[PDB]
Symmetry: D3
Subunit: 143 residues, 6 copies
């Protein structure tokens, strides 16, 4: 790991439903990993970066309205202009019975439930790199 | 404090702009504190709860597109059916120059910048309380 | 009251649901009061202003998809740079049975149902104040 | 006119921009007229109705982020199952200079600026009509 | 027809619901026809244009979450500054039973189901017309 | 290829901006490929399916507000419960100068510009497969 792990955390609201049955789409996780990756790039080189692509996105558990979700990312390798990052998505709380809209019961997921993993790469053109911006990234070094 | 502090963390995207000039509205913070409060209520008594009101919301710094934000909340007092909570909002990263849309430079806020505080109260009817759901809340006790 | 009361009015659509059960979050009301406050500031001094904070937000009735809502605000006191405003939220129509998604019946709320109240304050820096912009605000005077 | 005029009122936020240059699309007005029409149908016959179509939508002035807008509608004719309604859209306040994102100046539109008109028709199947729900509609009568 | 028919195609997600019962509003179709019209104007004269109005919008079948929809438009007449266009909306796939949120069954609409038609007009000021931009529009000629 | 290619087509509006500078996030493409994949699954086996993951997402050109985009997908292999699909994203029109918000000029991309590719897999549990629903998929066969 280069630098600290970045952790986003938020709730799936009714606005996050995508399919019928209060089911959130897997792309919602990818949206959040894009923002996690951006934060990592701000810290390592002071630019919001451009997202190049992914490998091995795996969606491992369904996500519903009322789930509380965490999205973890970290830099695995600092390249010359490209940065290889790893990502995870975890469910930390949920409604007890999504099928009953009037049921207000909810609980924690302890341990948390793995909902996705991915490897991604981000790019900052050499002329736009500004060096580390956040103290945990100070010994980021390039090849 | 009763139980653990809950920390939401996410990015302000262009979708979070509300006013002209890429300025986010203060209500965006209140939206997030509602979800923080919900998470606390899930953990303390197993219900999503109803939000009763606030006191002393203070908005202390402007928030823009490209800001990375954290939203902290915790339970201060467990009542019979009402729960008094404290909330904070903190900026952890930002664009360098929001006034130049083509400027991709961004940096950390170290130390983080205080953007808001509030006291709020949430309600779970007695019949809907289920006891603690998350281990850090196990010694929640009522009057 | 200084100037006229501003009244926003609109419908809660399915897009306004936040929690399960077609329940709208209280923060939706705060979002609308921010826009009511902005309109008041445009009229009193010709600037969109910055929202400083609230006191005594109280949420008094639940709001659902298909509710028609009014949001009232007015200036109580013109300060030097700060303006104290009062806000209310009222339900004027609703679905008869939110628990049956196929039920299309709806009715008025006559009398209207109080859903929230608040006191808030908004700020316009002295250099940005332009004087009244709307005829009902012409005798706005500062201390 | 049958019954009272319904008036929606709200702000165009940055979220309402559609085209480049902070320009709102004309369809945003049609969205709001759909909700105005729904409210009229709730009042005249107690059902949210189905929107059948329009004639003569005319868009008469551009709408931008930061405009405050009113949307008026009323019933012109109560049919057997169809209801002919008239609609208008009016601008009541606006930013002074949309082309300068840092300019916070705004003013009223006094008199208000006409932004659109339309004639539309809505439908409630005979079996779903429940009679008037709001006192101003009490003498709604059908052919 | 002047030039080619433009065809938009997409899915109604849960985010497109507007009324209760997973029902999409007719204005969603008008939103899409605005974007179809824009594309036609880009191709015929190189400007995003301004939408002037409609005649004869007819909404002919309800649209729900999980419907796959196509939106067709074409130029019927090139005027001096105004362009008369025709529009259609077609349903190509749908959920089998919208009333059961846990039912994941879906099917095609073969033949496709007509959901709307309209005639609209768009405007490009003479000074902003740039001539055809897309090869199928090369023989666009004005009066 | 098994069955026909599915083509989604739509516009990036101001609502699709994500980063500063009117830049759309790469996750917007992944959102659309999820809906393309869903449509393919409806046609091949009559269920909306669950998205399993991706390989080799590559983002190849930036996307901005005012771009018109096409999203292509097709089934490469029908498995027992998993379906391997290929996806592409293409830009077909764009604003001439995104950096000038008042510039309304736009043009076609002829030839269209490649913005992304991916391989993905979708899942329908055996008990939920219903056979082909759309005539071009009639000779879908499983191992
Ligand atoms: Zn570096
Ligand atoms: Zn308890
Ligand atoms: Zn003044
Ligand atoms: Zn009647
Ligand atoms: Zn021409
Ligand atoms: Zn099959």
């Amino acid at each position: 790991m280069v630098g600290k792990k970045v952790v986003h955390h938020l709730m799936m609201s009714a606005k996050d439903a995508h399919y019928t049955g209060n089911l959130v789409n897997g792309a919602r996780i990818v949206n959040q990993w894009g923002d996690v990756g951006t934060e990592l790039m701000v810290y390592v080189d002071g630019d919001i970066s451009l997202f190049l692509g992914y490998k091995d996105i795996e969606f491992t558990a369904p996500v519903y309205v009322g789930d509380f979700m965490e999205y973890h990312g970290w830099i695995e390798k600092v390249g010359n202009q490209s940065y290889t990052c790893k990502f995870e998505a975890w469910k930390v709380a949920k409604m007890v019975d999504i099928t009953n809209p009037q049921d207000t019961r909810a609980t924690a997921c302890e341990p948390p439930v793995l909902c996705g993993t991915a490897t991604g790469s981000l790019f900052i053109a050499k002329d736009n790199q500004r060096g580390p911006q956040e103290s945990s990234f100070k010994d980021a070094k390039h090849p």
